[PDB]
Design a protein around this ligand. Structure first.
Ligand SMILES: O=S([O-])[O-]
Ligand SMILES: O=S([O-])[O-]
Ligand SMILES: O=S([O-])[O-]
Ligand SMILES: O=S([O-])[O-]
Ligand SMILES: O=S([O-])[O-]
Ligand SMILES: O=S([O-])[O-]
Ligand SMILES: O=S([O-])[O-]
Lengths: 88, 86, 83, 90, 87, 88
């Protein structure tokens, strides 16, 4: 789109959040941090819910940066992910 | 339980609105009506732009009346009649 | 070689050089990045951190700096870097 | 810091090792011999790459014994004249 | 009457007094300081390097330095000593 | 030592030269005449400086070792008496 998440980062965020997490700290939390909590039931049936979430996120950007994504992962305590993004 | 657009109605809407329309009376207008147009770029990359819009709309939903109203505003009277008739 | 953005470098140095940051300052960062052997040198500079960051850049491990900040609770700086 | 290299000696060491005419026997070799080659790029940015290497060295100066790495370095670089001056002065 | 700081002498003496495997001891030092003709006398006391340094001191001007000594130790490859002096 | 001074003479020379006098005719002059003036400070440290001087003098003697250079120094110092005393 007018903006795209670099592939290596998208892949890491997805591998990390797609896995169902007993305590709610999976893609569901990202969806809530990006104000897409109303659509949870739609992402739930996709092979990669995190993938759909990030596509929608990209679609609504202008040519912006990864600040709101980095910042959401931060509030989720996804420390390693943050490091991962900076590293690349 | 949860709100669900009956499949036959989803398919009917998709076949009518996914089709090419010089006037723009298609999924793009439906998206605006359903307050989903912030994501038109995403919808465009899909096989059924309308299927995705309806699925997301349903999820955030339970009244089909809001949908009918959108379609009525779009002049899709022939479609509404075909649906009612089946 | 590589280079940390100036606005980021500025927030790092401001925080870690501060004496009110004792216990979570340049000394900790130096240890976390394996430059403990030169603590005494950093100490003679007005900005211990600026030098630490210069050595780190030269030694380029881009993961190590971000991991150190994360471990030091510097979330905003980390977000700035992920961005 | 426990021992400071005298200024006159520091000046001549830097004059020699910073010199481009000393390639093959300059600050780069000194850094490697002092186990600091990991930071070569940092030393290159300095007006005096040798001056900074020596500041770092002086910093590691814990107690008599660490001073051997340097002396050994000068000797191996043919700069013994320099070390003869350090044993002659505080 | 010039003098050598105790510590340094203590070091150098116990470092050279002990006979070295290839003659690199107070003996060689003697030759470097041109006291060749006196080895027999040095080899007649508690610490050989002791008198050698003693003779050297007395020879040094009232305001001299350990230059010629350090220089001797340099050609003998005694950096180990050119550091203790430095410190 | 390629030569040793008879203790009889040694004790004689030392008793005569260790005593300081206003003639400058003591161990300091002997040291000078034997080319050892540069070590004056050292000798002054010993109980018997003349003894030390004689030790160094004995030490540098070659095979032909002869009291000659020593007797000669004494002669130039106006000790001709002590010379025949050594002649005995
Ligand atoms: O188990 S995790 O959500 O910390
Ligand atoms: O998270 S809410 O805005 O759907
Ligand atoms: O758009 S059509 O189905 O009336
Ligand atoms: O394309 S028609 O429905 O205006
Ligand atoms: O000056 S050197 O590169 O031959
Ligand atoms: O050494 S002599 O005087 O018997
Ligand atoms: O008298 S001088 O030759 O030591």
């Amino acid at each position: 789109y007018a903006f795209k998440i670099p592939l290596s980062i998208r892949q890491k965020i997805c591998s990390s959040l797609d896995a169902p997490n007993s305590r709610g700290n999976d893609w569901r939390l990202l969806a809530q941090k990006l104000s897409m909590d109303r659509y949870l039931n739609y992402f739930a049936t996709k092979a990669s819910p995190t993938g759909v979430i990030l596509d929608l996120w990209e679609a609504r950007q202008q040519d912006g940066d990864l600040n709101s994504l980095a910042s959401a992962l931060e509030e989720m305590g996804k420390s390693e992910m943050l490091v991962a993004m900076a590293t690349d």
